[PDB]
Amino acid sequence: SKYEGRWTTVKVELEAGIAWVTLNRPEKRNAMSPTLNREMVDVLETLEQDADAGVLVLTGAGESWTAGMDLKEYFREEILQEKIRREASQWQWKLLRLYAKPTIAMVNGWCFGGGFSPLVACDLAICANEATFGLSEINWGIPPGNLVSKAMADTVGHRQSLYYIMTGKTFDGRKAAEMGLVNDSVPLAELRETTRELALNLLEKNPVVLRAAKNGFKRCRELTWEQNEDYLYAKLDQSRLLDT
Amino acid sequence: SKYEGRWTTVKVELEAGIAWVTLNRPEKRNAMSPTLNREMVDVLETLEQDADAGVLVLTGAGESWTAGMDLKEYFREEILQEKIRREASQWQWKLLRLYAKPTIAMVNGWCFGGGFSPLVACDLAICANEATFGLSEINWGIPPGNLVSKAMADTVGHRQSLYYIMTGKTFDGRKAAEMGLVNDSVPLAELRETTRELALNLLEKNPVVLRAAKNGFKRCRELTWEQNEDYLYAKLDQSRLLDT
Amino acid sequence: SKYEGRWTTVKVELEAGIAWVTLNRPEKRNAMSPTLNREMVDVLETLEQDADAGVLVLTGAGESWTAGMDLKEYFREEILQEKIRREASQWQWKLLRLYAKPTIAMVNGWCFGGGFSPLVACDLAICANEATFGLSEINWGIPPGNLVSKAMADTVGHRQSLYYIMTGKTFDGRKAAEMGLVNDSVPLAELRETTRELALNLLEKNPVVLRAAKNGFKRCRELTWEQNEDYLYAKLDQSRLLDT
Amino acid sequence: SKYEGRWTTVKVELEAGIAWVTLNRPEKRNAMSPTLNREMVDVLETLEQDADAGVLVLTGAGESWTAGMDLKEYFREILQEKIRREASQWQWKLLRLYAKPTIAMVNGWCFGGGFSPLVACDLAICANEATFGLSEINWGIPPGNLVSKAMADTVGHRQSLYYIMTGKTFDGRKAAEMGLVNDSVPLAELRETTRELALNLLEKNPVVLRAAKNGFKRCRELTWEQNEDYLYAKLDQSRLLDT
Amino acid sequence: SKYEGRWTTVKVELEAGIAWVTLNRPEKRNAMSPTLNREMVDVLETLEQDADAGVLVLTGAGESWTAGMDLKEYFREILQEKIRREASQWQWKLLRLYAKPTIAMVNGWCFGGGFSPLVACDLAICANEATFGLSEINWGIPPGNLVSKAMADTVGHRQSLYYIMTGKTFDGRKAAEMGLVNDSVPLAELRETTRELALNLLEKNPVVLRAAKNGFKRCRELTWEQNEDYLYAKLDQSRLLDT
Amino acid sequence: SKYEGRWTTVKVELEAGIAWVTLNRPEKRNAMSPTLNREMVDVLETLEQDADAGVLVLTGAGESWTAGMDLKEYFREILQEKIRREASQWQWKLLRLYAKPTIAMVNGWCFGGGFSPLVACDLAICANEATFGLSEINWGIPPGNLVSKAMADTVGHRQSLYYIMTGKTFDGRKAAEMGLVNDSVPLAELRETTRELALNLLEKNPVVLRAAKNGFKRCRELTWEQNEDYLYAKLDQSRLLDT
Ligand SMILES: CC(C)(COP(=O)(O)OP(=O)(O)OC[C@H]1O[C@@H](n2cnc3c(N)ncnc32)[C@H](O)[C@@H]1OP(=O)(O)O)[C@@H](O)C(=O)NCCC(=O)NCCS
Ligand SMILES: CC(C)(COP(=O)(O)OP(=O)(O)OC[C@H]1O[C@@H](n2cnc3c(N)ncnc32)[C@H](O)[C@@H]1OP(=O)(O)O)[C@@H](O)C(=O)NCCC(=O)NCCS
Ligand SMILES: CC(C)(COP(=O)(O)OP(=O)(O)OC[C@H]1O[C@@H](n2cnc3c(N)ncnc32)[C@H](O)[C@@H]1OP(=O)(O)O)[C@@H](O)C(=O)NCCC(=O)NCCS
Ligand SMILES: CC(C)(COP(=O)(O)OP(=O)(O)OC[C@H]1O[C@@H](n2cnc3c(N)ncnc32)[C@H](O)[C@@H]1OP(=O)(O)O)[C@@H](O)C(=O)NCCC(=O)NCCS
Ligand SMILES: CC(C)(COP(=O)(O)OP(=O)(O)OC[C@H]1O[C@@H](n2cnc3c(N)ncnc32)[C@H](O)[C@@H]1OP(=O)(O)O)[C@@H](O)C(=O)NCCC(=O)NCCS
Ligand SMILES: CC(C)(COP(=O)(O)OP(=O)(O)OC[C@H]1O[C@@H](n2cnc3c(N)ncnc32)[C@H](O)[C@@H]1OP(=O)(O)O)[C@@H](O)C(=O)NCCC(=O)NCCS
Known part of the structure; x- marks a missing residue:
């Protein structure tokens, strides 16, 4: 297939304009090793230029989505x-x-x-x-790494964010949904199907528009109303230009 | 009546200190044309100085609240x-x-x-x-206009915001309420009544105080705690002065 | 006991690494007088250095948590x-x-x-x-004092925040929980017990880590993703250093 | 003339694309009254849509630019x-x-x-x-409107705070040292230097010059990482608005 | 005297409304130790409520202002x-x-x-x-506390980073070029120039001067559009606090 | 040499810890093309991990530093x-x-x-x-990439906007007045002055110098009250990374 054999820790399948991306260390519950980080940069830069890819799905091999950073590795270690x-x-x-x-x-x-x-x-x-799901950094005796805290701060209310960060307790899919971490939670049985329906629905949209809409919304979160009048119109006009 | 005949696309009724404002192009589902934008500036500046207006309600004629910007108009077109x-x-x-x-x-x-x-x-x-309700800009092939994105970013969680922005799907009143877009959703039958009870309740409050409380809260959202100690006290003291 | 008699308006009990703090004017529903503010500074600076205190609980004497700032006192009054x-x-x-x-x-x-x-x-x-619960500043004819507005703006959605601020209406515990003001609401009967279980659970955690996790999360809320990559890693590294 | 007689407190002479806008209450040192405010809104809004107007210059009638807001008025709500x-x-x-x-x-x-x-x-x-001076302090009031922020954005905080705190005055040469102006030239050659520059700005593609100047001013409020998005959005916006 | 003997590392002479505050460990070049920190908190908090105190001046005993934080102490947690x-x-x-x-x-x-x-x-x-110099770098540590930000807010980033990166020293004339001070005058006339200015600040309505200076400093962190709200709130707050 | 022949548009000579990095399309005044961009990413990423490299200097081959982005390329999407x-x-x-x-x-x-x-x-x-000049305006485009913000962060807005709006050029002496450089010295002594300084920066603990310079730059975006947390976090981070 188009990308079969291109990466050791990640596999990519194209199907009907959908680039399905599978993290591929099922035996390490798809932990994120430096190898897998370097490959995932390449996978994203590669799929950006591939005009047969209209939408990405991110998923993991076996019974893991991911189990977080590669532990047996941080233990290892420095300008590196x-x-x-x-x-x-x-x-x-x-x-x-x-x-x-x-x-x-x-x-x-x-x-x-x-x-x-x-x-x-x-x-x-x-x-x-x-x-x-878990923010069990605390039980391993570290605070959340990278932008984990910030991911939570933008998504989950602070009462709920701090409980899960400070206690380390697990929560199920239904709960991720209550907290607004996911759009919805469905039986595993129906998951790949439901995701795909949505993926197809987004392929129906003008992709230069969808970009400006989705990526403009994210950035508008950090700006004031008065700043956004100027930002979001500049993004509306940009969108017009890059479409025709 | 006090303002009968003053605007072509908007009507205003005073009643018990309530300025009911109706957007008034029911046959265009109250779309927002430049005419209607210019009139609504005037209506707001006019009602600001009218001491018989204690609270505003914004509503629309017929079966539309509004159906958004006037399409058959943006098509038209530029320093203008x-x-x-x-x-x-x-x-x-x-x-x-x-x-x-x-x-x-x-x-x-x-x-x-x-x-x-x-x-x-x-x-x-x-x-x-x-x-x-709908953020159907995407089906018409544009990203949300003006501060629409920002309106959503302050109000609805991003999982839910981006679904509705990127898909274009409609949602009912009950759902606007789940998402925290409205305070509540009631049968149309009871709507005008319920709104009015609330409108009367806010008229009972010292209006220089209510201003500082409500408009100070909105702005405090953009400031840090340490900045707000100074801002919100300056607004507390301002309130004291403009009251007596 | 360790701190019995140290403050007039606040009492402190140590038990199993928990500093239970009780605000102690039950006959004034634990209103917050300048006396009580000065004592509570001292209580916090004192408990910070007391290595037998691993976690604090804040609570109030009798049937009040607190009834807010001391009214019959603001009436009194100025560089003071x-x-x-x-x-x-x-x-x-x-x-x-x-x-x-x-x-x-x-x-x-x-x-x-x-x-x-x-x-x-x-x-x-x-x-x-x-x-x-109540934000009844409005009925007493003032806007919320200090960082009250900001407390709400970080915690409760603006539809709900502004209703309670502008109307002055009361809400019960269950409702504080819906709005994400509290982590949970339990019968008074089970309250002290439930709080304590949680308090013990947090004592199990490396306290230099927990600090960096919880206090880093709070501050990350005010920073951009790109700023946080640098901030939250600096806090991760800080944590490493202050632990060993 | 086009605008002659249209405003009681302001006067607007178009000449070679330039729009000379004169604050016109010299009897009051062009003090900025509620009247002069409303008219100025109109003037700006009118000159925005006038295609014979390429640049604006703002100057004051007589020997006064303006001596600030109108103290007689200050004295006294929703209004x-x-x-x-x-x-x-x-x-x-x-x-x-x-x-x-x-x-x-x-x-x-x-x-x-x-x-x-x-x-x-x-x-x-x-x-x-x-x-110039920031005399508000001698009048027993702190700088009003956006004055402080005007100063914060252009003059170093030591100099900014000397003049806000003491209310001492300064002349045109000091103005330039501090970064408050582009240059200070003898009153004699002032209209000439302004016209030269105004002429230069008319040489430039107007839509581009907009994006350039108005993008630069906003870019101060943003971080580099945010600005990558903003300024490129203004670039494309600029390209889209040209024909 | 009022305050004579009240502080071991600091000395405070009131004279004509002025509150001369002297860092007082000249044997250590007034190095800022944990002791001198606690006392300084007290001093400021005491002088805030002293109505005979209109202005403060902060200066160091001897031939030293301060040579920074106390290196002997640095050496070594929750404390x-x-x-x-x-x-x-x-x-x-x-x-x-x-x-x-x-x-x-x-x-x-x-x-x-x-x-x-x-x-x-x-x-x-x-x-x-x-x-002056920013010698932290020669000691094998980066500027501490809010030092960096002190520099960022007042000195251009090229000059700021020369001195943070090299740890080279500079004299009073350079200090003024960079905007770190208001002026640099011969040690001879230093107490005189400071007193003159201090006297001038006492002429001013104290509550207004507060709003003016403390509003200006905060207004740097805010955008124009936010500042319209903030500064007018400080105006009214100022009016409310006058009698 | 270590890097000789490794890059087509860039040249990198290591000498005494210093990493002289030369933009190397002098036939094009080192115009910044997509090729020179990719190579420069590599160069920086390579020199980051080279322990013989303590400092970098960036300079251009010939009589040109760079004349900006490559106009021939500009001309024409997801790419x-x-x-x-x-x-x-x-x-x-x-x-x-x-x-x-x-x-x-x-x-x-x-x-x-x-x-x-x-x-x-x-x-x-x-x-x-x-x-130097900001000629984008004469080409009929507004400053691109982070140029505006480069200017906003270092040059006063009056001077910044003169040069963005007119597209007038300026020489090395002006560059220094504005704060765009640390100094302007005769081309004759340029390599010498740069080497001296580069040598000085090698004297410094490298990890500390990182924290110091990179903390200072970020601290501009933050308020004092936020910075108390940030900069102390960089202090400790700095201490943790030393051995
Ligand atoms: C995901 C998890 C529940 C899997 O449980 P499981 O199905 O029983 O699988 P196991 O726990 O037996 O682990 C299976 C293998 O995955 C590995 N693994 C799991 N998570 C890992 C991680 N984050 N890094 C490296 N290896 C990991 C285990 O070392 C084990 O390796 P081995 O059996 O090949 O020696 C468990 O591994 C886990 O809790 N990891 C927590 C990770 C975490 O919180 N990290 C901090 C986040 S940045
Ligand atoms: C609101 C809506 C569902 C009404 O459905 P309806 O009750 O069947 O009414 P219709 O759709 O028949 O439209 C009735 C009239 O309203 C007009 N109209 C509706 N929305 C309009 C808009 N945004 N601009 C201009 N005209 C509009 C139609 O052109 C039609 O005009 P005509 O019948 O006089 O020729 C439908 O008009 C609509 O979906 N509009 C979407 C607007 C939108 O998403 N715009 C982008 C937002 S900024
Ligand atoms: C808390 C509350 C419901 C208690 O009701 P209750 O159990 O009947 O008790 P009471 O209302 O009889 O008050 C009991 C005593 O508490 C005092 N008290 C209650 N709240 C107080 C406050 N904020 N400041 C000072 N005293 C207060 C009353 O003056 C009364 O004093 P006294 O009986 O010793 O003369 C009621 O006191 C209250 O609504 N306070 C509102 C406070 C508020 O909203 N303040 C603005 C917030 S910053
Ligand atoms: C500008 C100034 C030096 C002019 O010098 P001058 O030649 O002496 O002129 P004068 O102001 O004495 O008199 C001219 C007229 O201008 C008026 N005027 C000047 N500044 C004014 C202001 N800020 N508001 C209202 N009216 C003003 C005077 O009232 C006077 O009118 P009158 O003759 O009807 O009484 C002096 O007027 C001045 O500094 N005034 C303003 C003080 C100030 O800066 N206020 C700041 C508040 S924002
Ligand atoms: C200020 C300075 C030029 C004074 O010149 P000097 O006349 O040679 O005086 P010296 O420092 O040699 O000696 C005077 C005393 O001040 C003490 N001292 C000076 N700076 C100090 C500091 N930052 N912390 C603690 N003690 C200090 C010395 O230890 C010495 O005490 P001792 O006599 O008990 O050993 C020089 O002390 C200096 O630069 N020191 C500080 C270095 C620095 O800037 N550190 C930055 C960390 S924030
Ligand atoms: C730098 C400059 C003064 C050099 O003076 P010069 O000695 O006359 O050299 P010239 O540019 O005339 O010619 C040398 C070559 O450099 C090339 N060049 C110079 N600047 C360039 C740029 N920005 N992009 C692409 N090519 C460039 C020319 O095309 C020419 O190549 P050619 O000989 O193959 O046609 C002048 O080239 C210049 O200002 N150019 C760039 C204009 C600019 O600033 N653009 C801004 C857009 S970011």
Whole structure:
């Protein structure tokens, strides 16, 4: 297939304009190693230029979505660590959150802290009732890494954010949905199907418009109303120009 | 009556200190034309100085609240367009959001993107279970206009905001309420009544205080705690001075 | 006991690493007088250095949590008033909100505006179904004082925030929970018990980590994603250093 | 003339694309009254749509630019929320991000409230002879409207706070040292230097010049990382508006 | 005297409304120790409520302003969260938005941590002879507390970063070029120039001067559009607090 | 040599810890093309991990620093989202908060897009002879990428807007007046002055210097009250990374 064999820790399947992306260390519950961070940068930069990819789905192999950063690795370690950090950032949110194409997280199982940044950076998100979530950094004796805290701060109310961050307790899919972490939670049985219907629906939209709408909305969150009058019109006009 | 005949696209009725404002193009589902934007600036500046107006209700004629910006008009078109944009801003949020008197949106039917700015800029909002809402800019092939995105970003969680913005799907009143877009949703039958009870309740309050409370709260959202200690006390003291 | 007799308006009990703090003017429904503000600064600075205190609970004597600022006192009054204001700030949020140790509000009864700042500045919060809440500043003819508005703006959606601020209406514990003001609401009967279980659970955590996690999360709310990559890593590294 | 007789407190002479706008209450040192505020809103809004108007220059009749807001009026409610708003509407809400280039030509006394539209103008030329101060403090009031912020955005905080705190005056040469103006030239050559520059700005594609100047001013409020998005959005917006 | 003997590391002479506040460990070049921090909090809090105190001047005993934080102490936990907080409490949390005007009178060496309360003061006068540097870098540590931000807010980033990165020193004349002070005058006339100015600030309505200076400093953090609300709120607040 | 032949548009000579980095299309006045962008990303990323590299200097081959972005290319979509991103990636995303000290050594013409990596460098030395302008306006486009913001962060808004609006050029002496560089010295002594300073920066603990310079730059975006948390977090972070 188009990309079969291109990466060791990640696989990509194109189907009807959908680039399904699977994180591919099922035996390590798809933990995010530096290898996998470097490959995921490449996968995103590659799919950005591939005109057969209209929408991405992010998912994980086996029963993990991801189980967070690769533990048995941080233990290892240092100007190198600077660049290891940047390459986690590069794919998890620097590219993904304001991606030029629509993104959806399809959360099939374990999502554990670290995995929350790229979850939140996806435009939308469906999970399984049977998925299981955790900000268990605290039990391993660290505070959430990367933009995990910020992912939560934009998404979950602080009463609920701080409980889960400070206690380390797990929560099920239904609960991720109550808290507004995902758009919805459906039986695993119906997950891939439901995600796909949505994926197809977004392919129906003018993709230069959808970009400006979705990526303009995200940035407008950080600006004042009076600043946004100017920003969001500049993005409306930009959209007009890049379409014709 | 006091203001009967003063505007072509908007009507105003005073009753017990309540300025009921009706957008008045029912045959165009109260779309917001430049004419109607210019008149609504005037209506707000006029009602600001009218001491018989203690609280405003914003509502629309017939079965529309508003159906958003006037389509068959944007198609038309350009230094003019600059000023057409400003005059939409002037009434929809520049005057309305930090209005000197309490404001309530009474959403009786269709509310479609564009109509969301002045909906959110109103201090409070009641809708009918039977009203119907949409950010269908995307199906017409544009991103939300004016401060629509920002209206949503301050009001609805991003999972839900982006679904509705990116898909274009409609939602009913009950759902606007779940998402915190309105204070509540009641049968159309009871709407005008329920709105009025609330309107009367706000008339009971010292209006220089209510201003400082409501308009100070809105602005405090953009400031840090440490900045707000100084801002909100300056607004408390201001309130004291402008009252006696 | 360790601190018996140290303050006139506040009492402190240590038990299993928990500093239970009781506001202690039950006959004035624990209103917050300048005396009580000065003592609460001292109580927080004192408990910060006491290594037998791992977590704080904030609660009030009798049937009040607090009934807000001391009315019969503001009536009294002025460069003095400057310093009276600062000392309310000092304990209610300047020290409490980014406190070095975990904090929990245990809301046993009346909480009325003013009491909302230190409620929200606590990391977490449990209330009784039978507690009763109000932003009734408006009926007394003032806008919320201190950081009350801001407390609400960070916690409750604006539809709901502004209703309660502008109307002055009361709400019960169950409702504080719906609005995300508290983590949960339980019968008064089970309150002290439920709070304690949680308090013990947080004592199990590395306290230099918990600090950086909880106090880093709060501050990340005010920063952009790109700013937070640098901030939250600096806080991760800080945490590493202050632990060993 | 086009505009001759249209405004009681303001006078507007079009000449070679330039729109010379003269504050016209010299009997009051052009003090900024509620009347002069409303008219100025109109003037700006009229000149925005006048295609014979490429640049604006703002200057004062006589030996006065303006001596600030009208003290006689100050003296005394909801009506005050409007008069403030009208002061703002022209002195910076419209002026600072105006659709066309703007220059302040400061011929004489510029005190207090006058600093806002001074700063709000894209560029500014004064006279060696012109004299400024922030006298609000001597009148027993703190700088009003956006004056403080005008100062904060352009003058170093040590110098800013000397003049706000003492209310001492300064002349055109000091104005230039501080960064409050582009240059200070003898009153003699002031109209000439302003005209030269105004002519230069007319050479430029008007839509581009808009994006350039109005994008730069906003870009101060934004971080680099936010600005990558904003300024590129203004680039494309600029391209879209050309024909 | 009123305050004579009240503080071990600080000395406070009231004279004609002026409150001369002297950092008083000249044997240590007035190095800012945890003791001197706690006392300074008290001093500021005491002088806030003293109605005979209209202005403050902050200066150092001997030939030293301060040579920064106390290196002997630095050397070594939760207690560190307090000592930092106390350093902050006086050097800017209270000082920078102090209820009364504040002037730094810089008589001698001013290094490192000393720059925060330098900047935090509304105004500042130094001596030609006084010498400054940001030597933290030579000690193998980056500027501490709010030092960086002191520099960011007042000195251009090229100059700011030369001195933070190299740790080179500079004298009073350079200080003034950069905008770090209001002026640099021979040590001879330093006490005189400071007194003159201090006297001028006493002429002013105290409540108004507060609103004016403390509003200006905050207005830097805000946009124009936000500032319309903030500064008018400080205007009215100012009016309300007068009698 | 280590890097000799590794890059087609850029040349990198290591000498005594210093990493002289030369933009190397002198036939095009080192115009910044998509090729030179990609290579520059690589160069920076390579030099970050090279332990023989302590400082960087960025300079241009011939009598040109760079004359900005490559106009021949500009001319013509999703691919444009990448080429912009690559321009950004090196000119400020990596450079401005680079792990090692950075100096711009400006030997010749510096126009337009070149101002971003100019500003983004921690420090900068130019030649009396070198010539700059913001000519985008004459080309019928507004400053691109982060140029505006480069200017907003370092040059006073009056001067910033003169040069953005008119597109007039200026020489090395003006550059220094405005705060765009640290100094302007005869081309003759330029390499010497740059080397001296570069040598000085190598004296410093590298990890500390990082925290110091990169903390200072970020601290501009933050308020004092936020900065108390941020900068102390960078202090401790700095201590943690030393051995
Ligand atoms: C996800 C989880 C529940 C899986 O449970 P499970 O189905 O029983 O699978 P196991 O726990 O047996 O782990 C299976 C393998 O995955 C590995 N693994 C799981 N999470 C991992 C991580 N974050 N890093 C590295 N390896 C991981 C285990 O080491 C184990 O390796 P091995 O059996 O090949 O030696 C569990 O691994 C877990 O709780 N991880 C928590 C991660 C976390 O919170 N990290 C901090 C976030 S940044
Ligand atoms: C509101 C709506 C559902 C009404 O349905 P309806 O009750 O069947 O009424 P119709 O759709 O028949 O439209 C009735 C009239 O209203 C007009 N109208 C409705 N919305 C309008 C708009 N935004 N601008 C201009 N005219 C509009 C139609 O042109 C039609 O005109 P005509 O019959 O006089 O020729 C439908 O008009 C609509 O979906 N509009 C969407 C607007 C939108 O999303 N705009 C972008 C937002 S800024
Ligand atoms: C809390 C409350 C419901 C208690 O009701 P209750 O159980 O009947 O008790 P009472 O109302 O009889 O008040 C009991 C005593 O508490 C005092 N008290 C209550 N709230 C107080 C306050 N905020 N300040 C000072 N005293 C207060 C009353 O003066 C009364 O004093 P006294 O009986 O010793 O003369 C009622 O006191 C109240 O509504 N306070 C509102 C406070 C408020 O909204 N303040 C603005 C917030 S900053
Ligand atoms: C500008 C100034 C130096 C002019 O010098 P001058 O030649 O002496 O002229 P005068 O002001 O003495 O007199 C001319 C007229 O201008 C009027 N005027 C001047 N400034 C004014 C102001 N700010 N508001 C209202 N009227 C003003 C005077 O009332 C006087 O009118 P009158 O003759 O009807 O009484 C001096 O008027 C001045 O500084 N005034 C303003 C003080 C100020 O800065 N206020 C700040 C508040 S924002
Ligand atoms: C200010 C300075 C030039 C004074 O010149 P000097 O006349 O040579 O005086 P010296 O410092 O040599 O000696 C005077 C005393 O002041 C003390 N001192 C000076 N600066 C100090 C500081 N920052 N912390 C603690 N003690 C200090 C010395 O330890 C010495 O005490 P001792 O005599 O008990 O050993 C020089 O002391 C200096 O630069 N010191 C501080 C270095 C610095 O800037 N540190 C920055 C960290 S924020
Ligand atoms: C820098 C400058 C003064 C050099 O003076 P010069 O000695 O006359 O050199 P010239 O530019 O005339 O010619 C040298 C070559 O450099 C090329 N060049 C110069 N600037 C360039 C740019 N910005 N983009 C692409 N190519 C450029 C020319 O096309 C020419 O190539 P050619 O000989 O293959 O046609 C002048 O080239 C200049 O200002 N150019 C750029 C204009 C600009 O600032 N654009 C801003 C857009 S960001």
